Symmetry: C3
Subunit: 498 residues, 3 copies
């Protein structure tokens, strides 16, 4: 509303990075929408990367992140404090590294890889592997690795320490002048972060949780204009344990709060903790009004709200596709019951050998879908392409896309395919495509068991390229008028203004 509002939204996820999607791409778009309504919506991360500036720069150039959206990082905050406490490069650090490397001889392995040996004792001193903009230096003691200095543009940003099993047990972070501002213990057995020492402020913290809580109380002004939104479930404790009294906290659950493949009536451990404590924050936000009603009818909480996702209606291809191409662009995870779909490919091709499948994306169950299509020799017909950073250009050469799951928040990947004139085929599930797919109108829906009824539907479409177009043009105009943005945006503000 107000073009000069002091409202601001801090969206919290553990890490940002390139070549993902789903929850993050939803966060990127949500930031874009809020910025349009003159409300700054930025992102807060809590992990360390020495090249986040290069990653954020990439995410914006590659058109995945609105350029107005900033990422706040806990380590970038304390680094910048450190930067303004010193006004002289930390040469003693580079002298420390230089001194351990002198009186050594060099022996090359390959192009930018060399080892160094003391010319007096013959002792193994260092291993240096340098690219062109980054460099690592591994120091050795008693022929075991003890330390690694990491470089970016000839500058140290991290020092790692290694135990007896050659695993990290300690990290140090150096500012842009070479001064250490943060160091922390690492449990080598699981990689969990322990005690964290903020050297620049001479303060210690029990763990990363205690550090980021302290960080948010510094980053986020305790005003009712400050709004915290936690997408990732692994960041919720950070938002919940702050001593904010005025600031708002909204937990956004993205997934089904039901345990995967459990008929007990049990929930996800983390996704339930959020729900239980809904009456202590400003309310948990789901996506379907169904999932609201389920949580209503399970937990004693008077504070759940349903808000869908902003959709970006990009532009459909100039044409369609004629050749019997079916695709499944997704990340391979057992929760999607892909086992209960590739046994529809098999059920299709035998009635029509010209139907082809292009599988994109990666995952854990990729390598056993791989060693499964050749057991049946559908390598002939089915292809596991790979991860595509161009989801739409791979989408615009489909006749239709296919997907399934037993657990979803809603339809993200199915919706954005319907825009590109593509009639997707999926099951009816708990929370998802019971609303944006109208069966025998612009797409198809099947009970999540009748595995050849889906195999029946595909042949009603791929063999009818003139009917696999009207269903596509009735897809896009279906998305557009159904949820919009204003309907969704006013959901958010009325929650804010209260």
């Amino acid at each position: 509303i107000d073009p000069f509002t002091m409202k601001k939204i801090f969206m919290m996820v553990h890490e940002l990075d390139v070549n993902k999607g789903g929850m993050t791409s939803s966060m990127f778009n949500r930031s874009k929408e809020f910025y349009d309504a003159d409300i700054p919506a930025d992102i807060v991360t809590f992990d360390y990367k020495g090249n986040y500036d290069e990653i954020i720069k990439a995410l914006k150039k590659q058109g995945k992140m609105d350029r107005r959206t900033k990422m706040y990082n806990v380590f970038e905050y304390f680094k910048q404090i450190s930067n303004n406490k010193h006004f002289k490069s930390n040469k003693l650090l580079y002298k420390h590294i230089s001194e351990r490397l002198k009186n050594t001889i060099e022996i090359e392995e390959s192009k930018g890889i060399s080892r160094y040996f003391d010319i007096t004792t013959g002792t193994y001193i260092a291993y240096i592997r340098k690219s062109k903009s980054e460099k690592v230096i591994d120091f050795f003691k008693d022929n075991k690795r003890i330390e690694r200095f990491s470089f970016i543009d000839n500058k140290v940003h991290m020092k790692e320490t290694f135990n007896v099993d050659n695993k990290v047990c300690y990290q140090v972070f150096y500012d842009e002048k070479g001064y250490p501002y943060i160091s922390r213990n690492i449990n080598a057995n699981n990689g969990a972060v322990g005690k964290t020492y903020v050297l620049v402020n001479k303060k210690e913290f029990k763990n990363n949780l205690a550090l980021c809580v302290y960080y948010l109380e510094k980053l986020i002004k305790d005003s009712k204009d400050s709004i915290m939104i936690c997408d990732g479930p692994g960041s919720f404790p950070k938002m919940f344990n702050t001593n904010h009294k005025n600031a708002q906290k909204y937990g956004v659950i993205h997934v089904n709060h039901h345990e995967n493949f459990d008929d007990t009536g049990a929930f996800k451990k983390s996704e339930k903790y959020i729900i239980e404590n809904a009456n202590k924050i400003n309310g948990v936000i789901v996506l379907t009004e169904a999932q609201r009603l389920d949580i209503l009818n399970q937990f004693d909480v008077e504070n759940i709200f349903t808000i869908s996702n902003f959709v970006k209606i990009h532009n459909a291809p100039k044409h369609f596709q004629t050749e019997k191409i079916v695709g499944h662009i997704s990340r391979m995870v057992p929760t999607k019951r892909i086992d209960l779909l590739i046994e529809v490919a098999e059920l299709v091709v035998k009635k029509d050998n010209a139907v082809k499948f292009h599988i994109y994306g990666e995952g854990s169950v990729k390598d056993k879908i791989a060693k499964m299509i050749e057991d049946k020799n559908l390598e002939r017909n089915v292809f596991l392409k790979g991860y595509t950073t161009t989801p739409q250009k791979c989408l615009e050469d489909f006749k239709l896309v296919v997907s399934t799951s037993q657990y979803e928040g809603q339809g993200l990947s199915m919706i954005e395919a319907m825009i590109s004139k593509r009639p997707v085929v999926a099951f009816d599930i708990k929370y998802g495509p019971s609303d944006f797919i109208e069966d025998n109108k612009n797409g198809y829906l099947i009970e999540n068991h009748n595995i050849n009824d889906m195999a029946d539907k595909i042949l009603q479409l791929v063999n009818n390229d003139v009917l696999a177009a009207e269903f596509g043009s009735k897809a896009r105009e279906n998305i557009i008028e159904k949820y919009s943005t204003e309907s969704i945006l006013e959901k958010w503000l009325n929650l804010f203004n209260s």
Copy 2:
């Protein structure tokens, strides 16, 4: 006899310390008696403590140790030699510690606890925890602890070294000027002391045994006026392996030489080794003439003698106690068959709910006596108070004390209670209270099985406060005239003079 005798007794136990009793308190009193007869009786210990001066000072101020009694310590002997080899403080040591601490930043944990990090590399350097008179400094390498310097009044007395599992594998002891005089290897797996290097005399020793044998040959003049008395069974090898030809050696066995809870006819492993070699020293000393006769009738040894213990007849309360208070002040050990007594409390209270129990002292089987009285909910009635440094003031508010065992040397803890006008109740056993308890005269004795006959006897006393007094006044006057000191003292001298 002779007020100017050159006779001296060295009583040997591994360690002395505060808040114990039994064998040690017997040693403290025996020293007091011998000093009265103009024969110096001192104590020799073989362990290391940096605060033994403070402990001995406490033992005397707190009236547990005769002030004339000295403690000789093997490490205090070599420290004092070291003290007179140097006449200039070892500043290079404190410089060595200072240098490793400079260029560091401090980060506090609590009041006197801080960690230190190198301001150039961010490396974890040191952990310092200081009280007000003592201080520890833990140094780190590759984020693992390697060394600990221990301070007392700002002075180093010990440096410890740690292995990969963070356990001690090496110790160093510094004199009062900061010079190392003794270092030794420690087996981290069991804490056993290995090779011991006497740096001040440039001599090495296989273990602590070889070190203390050498020490006794220095400490104790090889004359017939020198008398060695080994109370602790764990110190006997130290006395036995010396090359003394004239000096006397007397091993004093305090306990039953029968294996605990074994009906085989087997003995304690250590207590038998002493017995087997009785014909090689000046004789083993037991406490009961019974235990003498048993050893006579088991081993071929013509050299066993029976001598009881000196009793200190202190002063009884001004009054008694009326309220049904029963106490067991003892150290909780399975050899005392406490299981076979707390199931007499149960057998008592049900006939008289006003009988109360106060349990003092500590032990291993305290925590399962604890979770046992509440299973039966005698928390109502039975109390595990705690260790009492005031045994008599806790004793002087009893009507009677109670105890049992299947194995004893004699009655120490039962005897000193009879002084304070208290009729104790105990079983008849191998070696013990068959002599200082006269049943139905001043106390009570039961077969060590009839667990409710004891429960019968208590009610014959606690419900008769006028009969639980005559039995008390017949207790003290019973101890006094029965064994005395002169009868016991002349036992010792006639052994000496031979």
Copy 3:
């Protein structure tokens, strides 16, 4: 032929050393023969010893190695290169060792054994054990050993590094001026040599195999006059993987290519790899024309040749031996079926108690032959003397020697005994004594099962000292005229000239 031929033979075995025999003694003699025919035949080794000069010097003085025969060593090659790159002693190395030893105090253990402790901290610094011409210095860190410097004539030739389990994980070799020329990683778990760094030439090598291949291409001129002969089966990959195009390669198999105690028809793993690749080198050389025919009738290889061994007909004793002395001078290994011979001693002595046995040499199954003759109490009669560096002087006091095996190349140890007027007794086997023992003529042969038929034959000889002499004099004159050297030598040259 040509007294000025540029032909040269490099005989390759992994290591040479004192107190062995068999394959090596065969190599020593073969070098001697070839040198007589004006063809230099030298030996190449691939292991490290700091005292090989002293060992080779011993092998020649003790008359086991022809003085014209040289040993080439891969580490001696790179050391000599290193020697000529520096013209100033590496004092900084000895300064490095001196500095770590100053400010220490000495504590002796025995004659030439002492430990050193820092006089400031008391820290365990070093352990030095010196003989009179060699010395080791073990340095310690956190009371664990980390390094060992090895000395010969006050000069460092090796530095070893130790891991957490106190095992070698790194080696460094110093030239005769104290400069490191080679360092290498050691797998502590098995002692296998990994990455090898040639510091003097700044080159790295995957392992010892890659190092010695490179070494042979430097050592051995790629000419048809250069001839490589690989005796040891463990050195064959080194000869086979060189990029020699003109040089000749001859693999000499010494043993049975049949798996020990396997009736499957399976071969030795290594000895087969040689055979399989016979068509890629200049031919594999066996010893018996039988073993040739077997390999012919198993593998598809058109390139196997049979050449026997050069025999050194030394000089027989002035006399014989009368006293019933039977000997088995050998190295104790289960492949010799000694179990199937000592149960003929037993079968002999019972018919003649005066027959005695002298067993020389060592082995793995010595200690259970030991605890076997006393179970039967033939200690009376059978003796395990020990390893004899004087094989012939121990041979010249026998009436006859005895041996057996199920696997041999031929008869080495049986043949050289026949020279000294001794009728040996052995079984007929695969590849061996079916040719140099003529039964009931100068010796005896039995089927390798009839264990008392051999026991029958001995008594036909030891009880007939006038018949145990003619068989001896028919032994020596049997060896002499049968194979000679010229017959064997021309076998070699005709292989060379082709």
